[PDB]
Amino acid sequence: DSCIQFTRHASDVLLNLNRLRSRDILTDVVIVVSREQFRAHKTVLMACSGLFYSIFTDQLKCNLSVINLDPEINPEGFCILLDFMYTSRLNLREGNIMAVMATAMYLQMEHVVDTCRKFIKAS
Amino acid sequence: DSCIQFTRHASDVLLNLNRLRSRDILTDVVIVVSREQFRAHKTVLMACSGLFYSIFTDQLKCNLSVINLDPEINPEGFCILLDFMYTSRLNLREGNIMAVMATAMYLQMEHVVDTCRKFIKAS
Amino acid sequence: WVIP
Amino acid sequence: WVIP
Ligand SMILES: CN(C)c1ncc(Cl)c(Nc2ccc3c(c2)CC(=O)N3)n1
Ligand SMILES: CN(C)c1ncc(Cl)c(Nc2ccc3c(c2)CC(=O)N3)n1
Ligand SMILES: [Cl-]
Ligand SMILES: [Cl-]
């Protein structure tokens, strides 16, 4: 086509979606990880995770307001990944890298799994 | 912070949100423009437009499944802008620039209004 | 704005 | 991935 493109548009969209999350505006699901609860937008979860994409395209699960993750999933690892989904920023540290990689493999977030594997290989 | 960042994340998120729109997955509103109907995600509309942000933060309008725009709004201008919201790409042409600028001013999409003003000034 |  |  003969379209023009606004370079910062996608980043500005994601920044506003994170502002809505922080104010709990139009969140339509709660993700339960052990005792911890995380509110989010189904569409953003699907856009970032192969696991959520599969869950919310299912004709029955698409209507659930609560999703319980496998009890092996660490709430801190999930929190770091949910923050990444809404910001593009990953808080990867020596003390959390194993829990982050395991959570990203479960959530099917291929690019996060790739950077965790590379950072572990270096050490 | 000490975060790392994935450069293509925001663009990849927006690409997936557009894939959901094209398949009509989790769309929660219909925007009526004269005889024409456009299905979309309320959160994406809010993230891109000052007008939709105001509408869907309103305690009564946040629950509407149908929104009717002012009859002066041109369906083609709206279609071009909805495409921009989901892609960052604007199909700006000599034959549509006046309808696109008027629709962007109504929708309160400041960056689109700015490029339309510049393209009109040049001609 | 750019030519993509 | 980059240092932002
Ligand atoms: C694959 N596909 C057509 C598609 N359309 C829409 C959405 Cl929201 C979607 N999201 C999704 C699927 C798989 C994966 C991801 C997002 C991230 C990932 O690493 N794998 N995937
Ligand atoms: C202004 N603010 C705190 C905010 N938070 C969340 C959202 Cl979704 C939002 N969106 C929005 C508001 C105003 C404008 C836009 C989006 C685009 C624009 O040109 N003006 N604005
Ligand atoms: Cl990823
Ligand atoms: Cl804009």
PDB file of C-alpha atoms and ligand atoms in Angstrom:
ATOM      1  CA  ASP A   1       0.000   0.000   0.000  1.00  0.00           C
ATOM      2  CA  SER A   2       0.846   3.774   0.041  1.00  0.00           C
ATOM      3  CA  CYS A   3       0.320   4.107   3.875  1.00  0.00           C
ATOM      4  CA  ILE A   4       2.438   6.308   6.226  1.00  0.00           C
ATOM      5  CA  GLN A   5       3.398   4.923   9.645  1.00  0.00           C
ATOM      6  CA  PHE A   6       3.573   6.423  13.164  1.00  0.00           C
ATOM      7  CA  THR A   7       6.710   4.855  14.766  1.00  0.00           C
ATOM      8  CA  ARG A   8       5.626   5.321  18.436  1.00  0.00           C
ATOM      9  CA  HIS A   9       1.951   4.189  17.982  1.00  0.00           C
ATOM     10  CA  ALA A  10       2.331   0.532  19.213  1.00  0.00           C
ATOM     11  CA  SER A  11       4.389   1.647  22.299  1.00  0.00           C
ATOM     12  CA  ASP A  12       1.813   4.429  23.094  1.00  0.00           C
ATOM     13  CA  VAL A  13      -1.061   1.888  22.770  1.00  0.00           C
ATOM     14  CA  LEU A  14       0.704  -0.513  25.208  1.00  0.00           C
ATOM     15  CA  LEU A  15       1.479   2.341  27.662  1.00  0.00           C
ATOM     16  CA  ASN A  16      -2.280   3.238  27.720  1.00  0.00           C
ATOM     17  CA  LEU A  17      -3.318  -0.409  28.151  1.00  0.00           C
ATOM     18  CA  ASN A  18      -0.969  -0.572  31.203  1.00  0.00           C
ATOM     19  CA  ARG A  19      -2.558   2.686  32.567  1.00  0.00           C
ATOM     20  CA  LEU A  20      -5.999   0.995  32.288  1.00  0.00           C
ATOM     21  CA  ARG A  21      -4.624  -2.110  34.098  1.00  0.00           C
ATOM     22  CA  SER A  22      -3.139   0.016  36.961  1.00  0.00           C
ATOM     23  CA  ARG A  23      -6.564   1.751  37.437  1.00  0.00           C
ATOM     24  CA  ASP A  24      -8.446  -1.602  37.026  1.00  0.00           C
ATOM     25  CA  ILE A  25     -10.400  -0.228  33.989  1.00  0.00           C
ATOM     26  CA  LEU A  26     -12.201  -2.794  31.747  1.00  0.00           C
ATOM     27  CA  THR A  27     -10.198  -5.733  33.226  1.00  0.00           C
ATOM     28  CA  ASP A  28     -12.327  -8.851  32.520  1.00  0.00           C
ATOM     29  CA  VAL A  29     -10.425 -11.710  34.206  1.00  0.00           C
ATOM     30  CA  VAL A  30      -8.613 -12.627  37.439  1.00  0.00           C
ATOM     31  CA  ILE A  31      -5.637 -15.020  37.203  1.00  0.00           C
ATOM     32  CA  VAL A  32      -5.209 -17.008  40.435  1.00  0.00           C
ATOM     33  CA  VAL A  33      -1.629 -18.143  41.245  1.00  0.00           C
ATOM     34  CA  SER A  34      -1.523 -20.013  44.603  1.00  0.00           C
ATOM     35  CA  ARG A  35      -3.001 -17.483  47.108  1.00  0.00           C
ATOM     36  CA  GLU A  36      -2.345 -14.461  44.795  1.00  0.00           C
ATOM     37  CA  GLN A  37      -4.830 -12.809  42.383  1.00  0.00           C
ATOM     38  CA  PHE A  38      -3.944 -10.750  39.279  1.00  0.00           C
ATOM     39  CA  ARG A  39      -6.478  -8.684  37.324  1.00  0.00           C
ATOM     40  CA  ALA A  40      -5.923  -8.291  33.568  1.00  0.00           C
ATOM     41  CA  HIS A  41      -7.410  -7.850  30.068  1.00  0.00           C
ATOM     42  CA  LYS A  42      -8.063 -11.179  28.271  1.00  0.00           C
ATOM     43  CA  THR A  43      -7.001  -9.665  24.877  1.00  0.00           C
ATOM     44  CA  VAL A  44      -3.575  -8.520  26.197  1.00  0.00           C
ATOM     45  CA  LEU A  45      -2.994 -11.955  27.854  1.00  0.00           C
ATOM     46  CA  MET A  46      -3.838 -13.675  24.494  1.00  0.00           C
ATOM     47  CA  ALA A  47      -1.605 -11.277  22.503  1.00  0.00           C
ATOM     48  CA  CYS A  48       1.401 -12.191  24.752  1.00  0.00           C
ATOM     49  CA  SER A  49       0.931 -15.853  25.676  1.00  0.00           C
ATOM     50  CA  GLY A  50       0.327 -19.040  23.680  1.00  0.00           C
ATOM     51  CA  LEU A  51      -1.329 -20.557  26.776  1.00  0.00           C
ATOM     52  CA  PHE A  52      -3.859 -17.667  27.227  1.00  0.00           C
ATOM     53  CA  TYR A  53      -4.465 -17.564  23.450  1.00  0.00           C
ATOM     54  CA  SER A  54      -5.510 -21.280  23.606  1.00  0.00           C
ATOM     55  CA  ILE A  55      -7.634 -20.734  26.788  1.00  0.00           C
ATOM     56  CA  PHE A  56      -9.624 -17.719  25.606  1.00  0.00           C
ATOM     57  CA  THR A  57     -10.278 -19.053  22.038  1.00  0.00           C
ATOM     58  CA  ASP A  58     -11.983 -22.042  23.674  1.00  0.00           C
ATOM     59  CA  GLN A  59     -15.800 -21.711  23.327  1.00  0.00           C
ATOM     60  CA  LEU A  60     -16.330 -22.531  27.097  1.00  0.00           C
ATOM     61  CA  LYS A  61     -13.252 -20.951  28.772  1.00  0.00           C
ATOM     62  CA  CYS A  62     -13.643 -17.647  26.800  1.00  0.00           C
ATOM     63  CA  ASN A  63     -16.557 -16.816  29.225  1.00  0.00           C
ATOM     64  CA  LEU A  64     -14.754 -17.526  32.543  1.00  0.00           C
ATOM     65  CA  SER A  65     -13.993 -14.525  34.811  1.00  0.00           C
ATOM     66  CA  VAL A  66     -11.504 -16.595  36.925  1.00  0.00           C
ATOM     67  CA  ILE A  67      -8.562 -18.770  35.673  1.00  0.00           C
ATOM     68  CA  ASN A  68      -6.537 -20.885  38.130  1.00  0.00           C
ATOM     69  CA  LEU A  69      -2.946 -21.659  37.096  1.00  0.00           C
ATOM     70  CA  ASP A  70      -1.085 -24.914  37.877  1.00  0.00           C
ATOM     71  CA  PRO A  71      -0.068 -24.926  41.645  1.00  0.00           C
ATOM     72  CA  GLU A  72       3.636 -25.296  40.610  1.00  0.00           C
ATOM     73  CA  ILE A  73       3.537 -21.704  39.208  1.00  0.00           C
ATOM     74  CA  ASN A  74       5.287 -19.130  41.398  1.00  0.00           C
ATOM     75  CA  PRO A  75       3.255 -15.837  41.958  1.00  0.00           C
ATOM     76  CA  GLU A  76       6.423 -13.666  41.718  1.00  0.00           C
ATOM     77  CA  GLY A  77       7.419 -15.229  38.359  1.00  0.00           C
ATOM     78  CA  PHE A  78       3.861 -14.602  37.091  1.00  0.00           C
ATOM     79  CA  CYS A  79       3.889 -10.968  38.346  1.00  0.00           C
ATOM     80  CA  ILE A  80       7.231 -10.268  36.504  1.00  0.00           C
ATOM     81  CA  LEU A  81       5.776 -11.785  33.286  1.00  0.00           C
ATOM     82  CA  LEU A  82       2.439  -9.892  33.551  1.00  0.00           C
ATOM     83  CA  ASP A  83       4.479  -6.658  33.964  1.00  0.00           C
ATOM     84  CA  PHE A  84       6.484  -7.619  30.794  1.00  0.00           C
ATOM     85  CA  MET A  85       3.244  -8.237  28.821  1.00  0.00           C
ATOM     86  CA  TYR A  86       2.058  -4.671  29.548  1.00  0.00           C
ATOM     87  CA  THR A  87       5.442  -2.846  29.272  1.00  0.00           C
ATOM     88  CA  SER A  88       7.992  -4.831  27.099  1.00  0.00           C
ATOM     89  CA  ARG A  89      10.287  -4.640  30.229  1.00  0.00           C
ATOM     90  CA  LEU A  90      11.507  -7.829  31.943  1.00  0.00           C
ATOM     91  CA  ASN A  91      12.833  -7.665  35.549  1.00  0.00           C
ATOM     92  CA  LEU A  92      15.249 -10.603  35.159  1.00  0.00           C
ATOM     93  CA  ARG A  93      17.524 -11.195  38.208  1.00  0.00           C
ATOM     94  CA  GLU A  94      19.796 -14.031  39.487  1.00  0.00           C
ATOM     95  CA  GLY A  95      17.275 -14.799  42.273  1.00  0.00           C
ATOM     96  CA  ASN A  96      14.214 -15.023  39.984  1.00  0.00           C
ATOM     97  CA  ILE A  97      15.541 -16.314  36.583  1.00  0.00           C
ATOM     98  CA  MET A  98      14.647 -20.002  37.204  1.00  0.00           C
ATOM     99  CA  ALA A  99      11.050 -19.141  38.311  1.00  0.00           C
ATOM    100  CA  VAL A 100      10.701 -16.649  35.379  1.00  0.00           C
ATOM    101  CA  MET A 101      11.892 -19.233  32.738  1.00  0.00           C
ATOM    102  CA  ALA A 102       9.588 -22.005  34.167  1.00  0.00           C
ATOM    103  CA  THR A 103       6.583 -19.597  34.184  1.00  0.00           C
ATOM    104  CA  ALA A 104       7.394 -18.376  30.591  1.00  0.00           C
ATOM    105  CA  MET A 105       7.615 -22.019  29.349  1.00  0.00           C
ATOM    106  CA  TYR A 106       4.191 -22.764  30.952  1.00  0.00           C
ATOM    107  CA  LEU A 107       2.681 -19.520  29.540  1.00  0.00           C
ATOM    108  CA  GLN A 108       4.304 -20.215  26.104  1.00  0.00           C
ATOM    109  CA  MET A 109       6.149 -16.855  25.819  1.00  0.00           C
ATOM    110  CA  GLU A 110       8.891 -17.950  23.383  1.00  0.00           C
ATOM    111  CA  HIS A 111      10.994 -14.722  23.377  1.00  0.00           C
ATOM    112  CA  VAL A 112      11.199 -14.665  27.232  1.00  0.00           C
ATOM    113  CA  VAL A 113      12.175 -18.403  27.295  1.00  0.00           C
ATOM    114  CA  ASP A 114      14.938 -17.604  24.706  1.00  0.00           C
ATOM    115  CA  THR A 115      16.510 -14.725  26.748  1.00  0.00           C
ATOM    116  CA  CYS A 116      16.367 -16.817  30.000  1.00  0.00           C
ATOM    117  CA  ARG A 117      18.162 -19.753  28.271  1.00  0.00           C
ATOM    118  CA  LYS A 118      20.876 -17.332  26.967  1.00  0.00           C
ATOM    119  CA  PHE A 119      21.375 -15.628  30.392  1.00  0.00           C
ATOM    120  CA  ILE A 120      21.611 -19.066  32.149  1.00  0.00           C
ATOM    121  CA  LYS A 121      24.120 -20.366  29.501  1.00  0.00           C
ATOM    122  CA  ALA A 122      26.372 -17.270  30.138  1.00  0.00           C
ATOM    123  CA  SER A 123      26.557 -18.059  33.909  1.00  0.00           C
TER     124      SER A 123
ATOM    125  CA  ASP B   1      15.223  -0.359  37.376  1.00  0.00           C
ATOM    126  CA  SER B   2      17.625  -3.071  36.022  1.00  0.00           C
ATOM    127  CA  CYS B   3      15.055  -4.417  33.439  1.00  0.00           C
ATOM    128  CA  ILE B   4      15.909  -5.646  29.887  1.00  0.00           C
ATOM    129  CA  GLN B   5      13.572  -4.711  27.025  1.00  0.00           C
ATOM    130  CA  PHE B   6      12.206  -6.601  23.988  1.00  0.00           C
ATOM    131  CA  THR B   7      12.182  -4.015  21.128  1.00  0.00           C
ATOM    132  CA  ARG B   8       9.463  -5.724  18.994  1.00  0.00           C
ATOM    133  CA  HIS B   9       7.058  -6.581  21.906  1.00  0.00           C
ATOM    134  CA  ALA B  10       4.610  -3.599  21.510  1.00  0.00           C
ATOM    135  CA  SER B  11       4.403  -4.109  17.676  1.00  0.00           C
ATOM    136  CA  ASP B  12       3.849  -7.914  18.146  1.00  0.00           C
ATOM    137  CA  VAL B  13       1.096  -7.213  20.744  1.00  0.00           C
ATOM    138  CA  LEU B  14      -0.677  -4.814  18.309  1.00  0.00           C
ATOM    139  CA  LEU B  15      -0.325  -7.300  15.400  1.00  0.00           C
ATOM    140  CA  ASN B  16      -2.059  -9.993  17.562  1.00  0.00           C
ATOM    141  CA  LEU B  17      -4.808  -7.584  18.661  1.00  0.00           C
ATOM    142  CA  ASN B  18      -5.484  -6.874  14.933  1.00  0.00           C
ATOM    143  CA  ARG B  19      -5.587 -10.686  14.253  1.00  0.00           C
ATOM    144  CA  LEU B  20      -8.257 -10.992  17.002  1.00  0.00           C
ATOM    145  CA  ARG B  21     -10.217  -8.079  15.429  1.00  0.00           C
ATOM    146  CA  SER B  22     -10.092  -9.678  11.915  1.00  0.00           C
ATOM    147  CA  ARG B  23     -11.469 -12.984  13.380  1.00  0.00           C
ATOM    148  CA  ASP B  24     -14.016 -11.078  15.581  1.00  0.00           C
ATOM    149  CA  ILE B  25     -12.498 -12.595  18.793  1.00  0.00           C
ATOM    150  CA  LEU B  26     -13.427 -10.921  22.139  1.00  0.00           C
ATOM    151  CA  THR B  27     -14.730  -7.753  20.377  1.00  0.00           C
ATOM    152  CA  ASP B  28     -17.110  -6.109  22.905  1.00  0.00           C
ATOM    153  CA  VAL B  29     -18.561  -3.103  21.037  1.00  0.00           C
ATOM    154  CA  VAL B  30     -20.049  -2.080  17.673  1.00  0.00           C
ATOM    155  CA  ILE B  31     -19.422   1.491  16.453  1.00  0.00           C
ATOM    156  CA  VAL B  32     -22.256   2.692  14.193  1.00  0.00           C
ATOM    157  CA  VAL B  33     -21.299   5.311  11.550  1.00  0.00           C
ATOM    158  CA  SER B  34     -24.337   6.223   9.376  1.00  0.00           C
ATOM    159  CA  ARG B  35     -25.478   2.836   7.930  1.00  0.00           C
ATOM    160  CA  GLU B  36     -22.073   1.141   8.602  1.00  0.00           C
ATOM    161  CA  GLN B  37     -21.116  -1.010  11.631  1.00  0.00           C
ATOM    162  CA  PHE B  38     -17.572  -1.620  12.945  1.00  0.00           C
ATOM    163  CA  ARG B  39     -16.720  -4.237  15.579  1.00  0.00           C
ATOM    164  CA  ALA B  40     -13.809  -3.496  17.935  1.00  0.00           C
ATOM    165  CA  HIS B  41     -12.209  -3.900  21.389  1.00  0.00           C
ATOM    166  CA  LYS B  42     -13.154  -1.094  23.833  1.00  0.00           C
ATOM    167  CA  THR B  43      -9.605  -1.100  25.363  1.00  0.00           C
ATOM    168  CA  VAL B  44      -7.887  -0.564  21.964  1.00  0.00           C
ATOM    169  CA  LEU B  45     -10.376   2.248  21.078  1.00  0.00           C
ATOM    170  CA  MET B  46      -9.608   3.943  24.469  1.00  0.00           C
ATOM    171  CA  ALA B  47      -5.824   3.512  24.028  1.00  0.00           C
ATOM    172  CA  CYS B  48      -5.999   5.352  20.634  1.00  0.00           C
ATOM    173  CA  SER B  49      -8.741   7.963  21.009  1.00  0.00           C
ATOM    174  CA  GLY B  50      -9.459  10.718  23.539  1.00  0.00           C
ATOM    175  CA  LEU B  51     -13.161  10.484  22.608  1.00  0.00           C
ATOM    176  CA  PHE B  52     -13.414   6.684  23.283  1.00  0.00           C
ATOM    177  CA  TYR B  53     -11.306   7.071  26.452  1.00  0.00           C
ATOM    178  CA  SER B  54     -13.919   9.591  27.774  1.00  0.00           C
ATOM    179  CA  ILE B  55     -16.883   7.383  26.649  1.00  0.00           C
ATOM    180  CA  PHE B  56     -15.722   4.097  28.166  1.00  0.00           C
ATOM    181  CA  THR B  57     -14.514   5.611  31.510  1.00  0.00           C
ATOM    182  CA  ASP B  58     -18.073   6.879  32.002  1.00  0.00           C
ATOM    183  CA  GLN B  59     -19.875   4.711  34.620  1.00  0.00           C
ATOM    184  CA  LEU B  60     -23.001   4.336  32.327  1.00  0.00           C
ATOM    185  CA  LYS B  61     -21.485   4.258  28.795  1.00  0.00           C
ATOM    186  CA  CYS B  62     -18.754   1.719  29.822  1.00  0.00           C
ATOM    187  CA  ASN B  63     -21.543  -0.977  29.702  1.00  0.00           C
ATOM    188  CA  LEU B  64     -22.984  -0.148  26.237  1.00  0.00           C
ATOM    189  CA  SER B  65     -22.446  -2.724  23.444  1.00  0.00           C
ATOM    190  CA  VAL B  66     -23.427  -0.161  20.721  1.00  0.00           C
ATOM    191  CA  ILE B  67     -22.059   3.423  20.231  1.00  0.00           C
ATOM    192  CA  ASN B  68     -23.547   5.713  17.557  1.00  0.00           C
ATOM    193  CA  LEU B  69     -21.225   8.421  16.201  1.00  0.00           C
ATOM    194  CA  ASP B  70     -22.328  11.923  15.113  1.00  0.00           C
ATOM    195  CA  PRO B  71     -24.148  11.673  11.671  1.00  0.00           C
ATOM    196  CA  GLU B  72     -21.552  14.103  10.159  1.00  0.00           C
ATOM    197  CA  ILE B  73     -18.867  11.356  10.517  1.00  0.00           C
ATOM    198  CA  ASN B  74     -17.930   9.661   7.240  1.00  0.00           C
ATOM    199  CA  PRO B  75     -17.759   5.759   7.433  1.00  0.00           C
ATOM    200  CA  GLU B  76     -14.669   5.634   5.143  1.00  0.00           C
ATOM    201  CA  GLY B  77     -12.764   8.146   7.329  1.00  0.00           C
ATOM    202  CA  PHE B  78     -13.678   6.056  10.405  1.00  0.00           C
ATOM    203  CA  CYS B  79     -12.590   2.787   8.699  1.00  0.00           C
ATOM    204  CA  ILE B  80      -9.137   4.309   7.795  1.00  0.00           C
ATOM    205  CA  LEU B  81      -8.706   5.491  11.427  1.00  0.00           C
ATOM    206  CA  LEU B  82      -9.817   2.144  12.959  1.00  0.00           C
ATOM    207  CA  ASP B  83      -7.244   0.418  10.682  1.00  0.00           C
ATOM    208  CA  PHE B  84      -4.569   2.909  11.961  1.00  0.00           C
ATOM    209  CA  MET B  85      -5.493   2.165  15.617  1.00  0.00           C
ATOM    210  CA  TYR B  86      -4.801  -1.563  15.090  1.00  0.00           C
ATOM    211  CA  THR B  87      -1.742  -1.281  12.761  1.00  0.00           C
ATOM    212  CA  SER B  88       0.084   2.135  13.166  1.00  0.00           C
ATOM    213  CA  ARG B  89      -0.491   2.506   9.341  1.00  0.00           C
ATOM    214  CA  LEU B  90      -2.522   5.430   7.954  1.00  0.00           C
ATOM    215  CA  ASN B  91      -3.971   5.226   4.398  1.00  0.00           C
ATOM    216  CA  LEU B  92      -3.847   8.994   3.761  1.00  0.00           C
ATOM    217  CA  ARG B  93      -4.785  10.024   0.172  1.00  0.00           C
ATOM    218  CA  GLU B  94      -5.753  13.286  -1.634  1.00  0.00           C
ATOM    219  CA  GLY B  95      -9.370  12.047  -1.939  1.00  0.00           C
ATOM    220  CA  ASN B  96      -9.788  11.134   1.756  1.00  0.00           C
ATOM    221  CA  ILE B  97      -7.525  13.599   3.706  1.00  0.00           C
ATOM    222  CA  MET B  98     -10.332  16.076   4.581  1.00  0.00           C
ATOM    223  CA  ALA B  99     -12.660  13.279   5.868  1.00  0.00           C
ATOM    224  CA  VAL B 100      -9.713  11.636   7.750  1.00  0.00           C
ATOM    225  CA  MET B 101      -8.678  14.947   9.492  1.00  0.00           C
ATOM    226  CA  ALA B 102     -12.338  15.770  10.473  1.00  0.00           C
ATOM    227  CA  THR B 103     -12.835  12.216  11.871  1.00  0.00           C
ATOM    228  CA  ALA B 104      -9.454  12.367  13.770  1.00  0.00           C
ATOM    229  CA  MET B 105     -10.412  15.768  15.310  1.00  0.00           C
ATOM    230  CA  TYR B 106     -13.783  14.293  16.453  1.00  0.00           C
ATOM    231  CA  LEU B 107     -12.082  11.110  17.788  1.00  0.00           C
ATOM    232  CA  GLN B 108      -9.321  13.238  19.452  1.00  0.00           C
ATOM    233  CA  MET B 109      -6.350  11.453  17.790  1.00  0.00           C
ATOM    234  CA  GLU B 110      -3.788  14.282  18.084  1.00  0.00           C
ATOM    235  CA  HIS B 111      -0.915  12.681  16.078  1.00  0.00           C
ATOM    236  CA  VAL B 112      -3.221  11.937  13.072  1.00  0.00           C
ATOM    237  CA  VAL B 113      -4.624  15.535  13.182  1.00  0.00           C
ATOM    238  CA  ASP B 114      -0.978  16.832  13.181  1.00  0.00           C
ATOM    239  CA  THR B 115       0.108  14.823  10.065  1.00  0.00           C
ATOM    240  CA  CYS B 116      -3.121  15.812   8.175  1.00  0.00           C
ATOM    241  CA  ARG B 117      -2.500  19.538   8.928  1.00  0.00           C
ATOM    242  CA  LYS B 118       1.135  19.192   7.666  1.00  0.00           C
ATOM    243  CA  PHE B 119       0.120  17.319   4.450  1.00  0.00           C
ATOM    244  CA  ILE B 120      -2.632  19.935   3.710  1.00  0.00           C
ATOM    245  CA  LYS B 121      -0.176  22.858   4.351  1.00  0.00           C
ATOM    246  CA  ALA B 122       2.307  21.310   1.800  1.00  0.00           C
ATOM    247  CA  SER B 123      -0.393  21.277  -0.954  1.00  0.00           C
TER     248      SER B 123
ATOM    249  CA  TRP C   1       5.745   9.547  10.736  1.00  0.00           C
ATOM    250  CA  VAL C   2       7.761   7.397   8.210  1.00  0.00           C
ATOM    251  CA  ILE C   3       7.448   5.501   4.877  1.00  0.00           C
ATOM    252  CA  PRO C   4       7.247   1.878   6.216  1.00  0.00           C
TER     253      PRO C   4
ATOM    254  CA  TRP D   1      16.607  -7.576  23.759  1.00  0.00           C
ATOM    255  CA  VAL D   2      18.266  -4.224  24.799  1.00  0.00           C
ATOM    256  CA  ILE D   3      19.231  -2.115  27.870  1.00  0.00           C
ATOM    257  CA  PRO D   4      16.397   0.516  27.757  1.00  0.00           C
TER     258      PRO D   4
HETATM  259  C1  LIG E   1      -1.031 -17.710  16.192  1.00  0.00           C
HETATM  260  N1  LIG E   1      -2.114 -16.680  15.993  1.00  0.00           N
HETATM  261  C2  LIG E   1      -2.810 -16.718  14.672  1.00  0.00           C
HETATM  262  C3  LIG E   1      -2.454 -15.713  16.994  1.00  0.00           C
HETATM  263  N2  LIG E   1      -3.498 -14.820  16.762  1.00  0.00           N
HETATM  264  C4  LIG E   1      -3.875 -14.029  17.780  1.00  0.00           C
HETATM  265  C5  LIG E   1      -3.251 -14.078  19.017  1.00  0.00           C
HETATM  266 CL1  LIG E   1      -3.817 -13.134  20.250  1.00  0.00          CL
HETATM  267  C6  LIG E   1      -2.155 -14.981  19.194  1.00  0.00           C
HETATM  268  N3  LIG E   1      -1.372 -14.952  20.318  1.00  0.00           N
HETATM  269  C7  LIG E   1      -0.333 -15.864  20.698  1.00  0.00           C
HETATM  270  C8  LIG E   1      -0.200 -17.206  20.255  1.00  0.00           C
HETATM  271  C9  LIG E   1       0.985 -17.952  20.449  1.00  0.00           C
HETATM  272  C10 LIG E   1       2.061 -17.299  21.097  1.00  0.00           C
HETATM  273  C11 LIG E   1       1.953 -15.947  21.549  1.00  0.00           C
HETATM  274  C12 LIG E   1       0.777 -15.210  21.370  1.00  0.00           C
HETATM  275  C13 LIG E   1       3.248 -15.542  22.199  1.00  0.00           C
HETATM  276  C14 LIG E   1       4.128 -16.791  22.014  1.00  0.00           C
HETATM  277  O1  LIG E   1       5.306 -16.944  22.314  1.00  0.00           O
HETATM  278  N4  LIG E   1       3.356 -17.791  21.376  1.00  0.00           N
HETATM  279  N5  LIG E   1      -1.767 -15.793  18.181  1.00  0.00           N
HETATM  280  C1  LIG E   2      -4.790  10.471  29.689  1.00  0.00           C
HETATM  281  N1  LIG E   2      -4.755   9.099  30.312  1.00  0.00           N
HETATM  282  C2  LIG E   2      -4.334   9.047  31.744  1.00  0.00           C
HETATM  283  C3  LIG E   2      -5.089   7.911  29.583  1.00  0.00           C
HETATM  284  N2  LIG E   2      -5.082   6.679  30.234  1.00  0.00           N
HETATM  285  C4  LIG E   2      -5.539   5.615  29.553  1.00  0.00           C
HETATM  286  C5  LIG E   2      -5.993   5.720  28.247  1.00  0.00           C
HETATM  287 CL1  LIG E   2      -6.617   4.386  27.495  1.00  0.00          CL
HETATM  288  C6  LIG E   2      -5.941   6.998  27.606  1.00  0.00           C
HETATM  289  N3  LIG E   2      -6.191   7.144  26.268  1.00  0.00           N
HETATM  290  C7  LIG E   2      -6.305   8.358  25.514  1.00  0.00           C
HETATM  291  C8  LIG E   2      -6.639   9.634  26.037  1.00  0.00           C
HETATM  292  C9  LIG E   2      -6.465  10.825  25.294  1.00  0.00           C
HETATM  293  C10 LIG E   2      -5.923  10.700  23.992  1.00  0.00           C
HETATM  294  C11 LIG E   2      -5.577   9.426  23.444  1.00  0.00           C
HETATM  295  C12 LIG E   2      -5.759   8.245  24.172  1.00  0.00           C
HETATM  296  C13 LIG E   2      -5.038   9.620  22.053  1.00  0.00           C
HETATM  297  C14 LIG E   2      -5.057  11.151  21.890  1.00  0.00           C
HETATM  298  O1  LIG E   2      -4.650  11.822  20.949  1.00  0.00           O
HETATM  299  N4  LIG E   2      -5.610  11.718  23.064  1.00  0.00           N
HETATM  300  N5  LIG E   2      -5.492   8.084  28.281  1.00  0.00           N
HETATM  301 CL    CL E   3       7.561 -13.433  24.682  1.00  0.00          CL
HETATM  302 CL    CL E   4      -3.054   9.570  17.025  1.00  0.00          CL
END
